[PDB]
């Protein structure tokens, strides 16, 4: 029955033409009246050391003072940002780790990697040591990103074209999101925690409703794999970083690509993308051994962070948006301000 | 200028750092080997002689070996490959009794051909620019039995030689070893396994000892 292929062509063309009709102007033309941010200088107010291998993940705590970092050595380290003191040093059962998560309440942490298992550790145990609270299994690929929702709910993304919403007490997959045609590499929850976004290794991003479990929108435009996704603080837009050495800004309600950020002197893709609290700044981490601070409203480049020796592996910004913690494969975590 | 509790926190942090450094020193004296193959090309048997990631820890002549098998992870080699960098060696198992065999997929494709392209992709990867390969050639006996009936020319329509096991095996080795385009930094310690004795681990031990000597000489700055 070849008719279904023609039908798919028909709806695809209808969607594309409706999208083209909807657009009337460009964000650059509308924004070409405001004063540019200028030139941002940031200094490493603190350097955190103690890892003996590459750093593969990092998540800021609920406050602006605690954070958690994972290394391929096989260690999860909890750092007190203000005084560089180490609060906890959890040894993992598998050294192949590619993700991290910090619970909003601060009671639990999450870990995962090539073992296809999401391990949830309890931080505040009355005995006085960190224990493995739970071990969730059911994925058939490497875990790429896990983010907490409540103290009793997590969302994971695997490399088998599948995202999942779990239930910590029962340990069962409450909901499964499928539809991607490649490995999912990033995940970002909405500020209201009612929906999220996933970027897969087929140059596509998808919008997911947590409770319903069905996709709502899909955005294309990239020409390579997608390595990182960040959500705008407004909750109605997001940013994608790809291996095409190009960032893009998508909007949900309009369902369009607003701006593209790229330069002729950049040839390596982005590995981590994160907005600022005001939304006027976008920080990206390349393989050029440095991080770059663009201007999300004018599509120019403002700042650079070149403290790390090797390339920027993971990047995040404080909840109040003053410090920027960036960890790299050369076993260093720099706190810029 | 420090409170009573803050000094105790600093003491705890220093103890944590001490433990981390001790763990790092203790975990840096084990030889790590990656394992790769094409299908069920004798990999299970090779592991027997000596989900996801499968780690096997064993000991030979006071040397501790950790071997990582990634057979389960089918999705995308490129994304997880960079995790294994700085490994002491890469074992590559090739079943050479498959010249007359094709995939379960009904694509006319002889098993070593995809093995050849997999070897080419792995050998010339930018991560493994100075990592030695310990290529093993398996199923020697079955190949020897089959070569009398079905000639090797069905796989290689260029070979001009007798249907004898020795020279056919030499041809296969020669056409599996030319793909190394980086002959200046890395080595290919080929071996004809499946002899069913305690000799594969000996070959691996010799290769890793040579790699250890080279790494020590590079570290000392004398070489």
């Amino acid at each position, epitope marked *: 029955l070849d008719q279904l292929r023609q039908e798919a062509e028909q709806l695809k063309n209808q969607i594309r033409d409706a999208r083209k009709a909807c657009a009337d102007a460009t964000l650059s033309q509308i924004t070409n009246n405001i004063d540019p941010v200028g030139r941002i200088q940031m200094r490493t107010r603190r350097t955190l050391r103690g890892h003996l291998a590459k750093i593969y993940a990092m998540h800021w705590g609920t406050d602006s003072r605690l954070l958690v970092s994972a290394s391929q050595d096989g260690k999860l380290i909890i750092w007190d940002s203000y005084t560089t003191n180490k609060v906890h040093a959890i040894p993992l059962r598998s050294s192949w780790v590619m993700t991290c998560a910090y619970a909003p309440s601060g009671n639990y942490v999450a870990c995962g990697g090539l073992d296809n298992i999401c391990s949830i550790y309890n931080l505040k145990t*009355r*005995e006085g*040591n960190v224990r493995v609270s739970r071990e969730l299994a059911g994925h058939t690929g490497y875990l790429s990103c896990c983010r907490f929702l409540d103290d009793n709910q997590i969302v994971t993304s695997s490399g088998d074209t599948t995202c999942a919403l779990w239930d910590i007490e029962t340990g069962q997959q409450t909901t499964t999101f499928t539809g991607h045609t490649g490995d999912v590499m990033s995940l970002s929850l909405a500020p209201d925690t009612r929906l999220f976004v996933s970027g897969a290794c087929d140059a596509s991003a998808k919008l997911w409703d947590v409770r319903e479990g069905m996709c709502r929108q899909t955005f294309t435009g990239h020409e390579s794999d997608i390595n990182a996704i960040c959500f705008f603080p407004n909750g109605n837009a997001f940013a994608t970083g790809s291996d095409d050495a190009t960032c893009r800004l998508f909007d949900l309600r309009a369902d369009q690509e607003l701006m593209t950020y790229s330069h002729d002197n950049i040839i390596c893709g982005i590995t981590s993308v994160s907005f600022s609290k005001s939304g006027r700044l976008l920080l990206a981490g390349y393989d050029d051994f440095n991080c770059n601070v663009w201007d999300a409203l004018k599509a120019d480049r403002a700042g650079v962070l070149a403290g790390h020796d090797n390339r920027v592996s993971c990047l995040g910004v404080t909840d109040d948006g003053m410090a920027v913690a960036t960890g790299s494969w050369d076993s260093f975590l720099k706190i810029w301000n | 200028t420090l409170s*009573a509790e803050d000094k105790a926190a600093v003491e*705890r942090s220093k103890m944590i750092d001490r433990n981390l450094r001790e763990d790092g020193e203790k975990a840096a004296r084990e030889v790590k080997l990656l394992l790769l193959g094409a299908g069920e090309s004798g990999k299970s048997t090779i592991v027997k002689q000596m989900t996801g990631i499968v780690e096997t820890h064993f000991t030979f002549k006071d040397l501790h070996f950790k071997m990582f098998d990634v057979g389960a992870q089918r999705s995308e080699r490129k994304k997880w490959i960079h995790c294994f960098e700085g490994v002491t060696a890469i074992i590559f198992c090739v079943a050479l009794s498959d010249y007359d065999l094709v995939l379960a997929e009904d694509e006319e494709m002889n098993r070593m051909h995809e093995s050849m392209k997999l070897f080419d992709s792995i050998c010339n990867n930018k991560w493994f620019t100075d990592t030695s390969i310990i290529l093993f050639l398996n199923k020697k006996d079955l190949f020897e039995e089959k070569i009398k009936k079905s000639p090797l020319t069905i796989c290689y329509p260029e070979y001009a030689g007798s249907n004898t096991y020795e020279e056919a095996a030499a041809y296969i080795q020669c056409q599996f070893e030319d793909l190394n385009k980086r002959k200046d930094t890395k080595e290919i310690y080929t071996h004809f396994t499946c002899s069913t004795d305690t000799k594969n681990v000996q070959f691996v031990f010799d290769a890793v000892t040579d790699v250890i000597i080279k790494n020590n000489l590079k570290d000392c700055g004398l070489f």
Partner: single-chain antibody
Amino acid sequence: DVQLVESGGGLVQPGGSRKLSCSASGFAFSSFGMHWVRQAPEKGLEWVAYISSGSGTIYYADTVKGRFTISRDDPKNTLFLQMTSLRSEDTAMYYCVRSIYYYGSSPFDFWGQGTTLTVSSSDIVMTQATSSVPVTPGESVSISCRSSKSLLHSNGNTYLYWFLQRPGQSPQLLIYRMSNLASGVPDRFSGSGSGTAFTLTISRLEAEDVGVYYCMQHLEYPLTFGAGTKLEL
């Protein structure tokens, strides 16, 4: 199942020596600092000694400094107190207290059962003027403690602790850092105040809250206690 059991007490002739043993069970003893505290038969609590994790830091009270000794044995997770040349003022009840220090931790959370010893015959000072207050069930109660020095540090922390001791029971931690409640404590307790003047309030008073309340100065390792406020009838 995290009880601590202490032994070594008894009637002692003056000038003798003794060993006090605190045996632990059910927690990571190697990561907890340990304190030996003393309570007179009719007076309040008094700090005696402190040992850190790894035995890298040991502190003694000025009244017994150079006379007693402390030690810990991690593999059998047992705390030892060497007591020598006992005077007539060393008859008391000894408590073995655990405390772990990191960001957001709660020191002095758990207290031992206490062992009795009878013998035959600058520093911040914390005062509690209110000796006793008559309270009927169902009221709101206030307890005021005062200091001789500012307990507020430059980092914002105010090191003041509030403990409760029921009749014939070991002391229990109520409030740590003057504002944070301990685990398992009902929400009806609260604490506030500023430097040199702190106040603990209890709402909807119940039959259980009968006991003696003590304030605690943790800014210095002398760890001066208060006189204690009694609530009865």
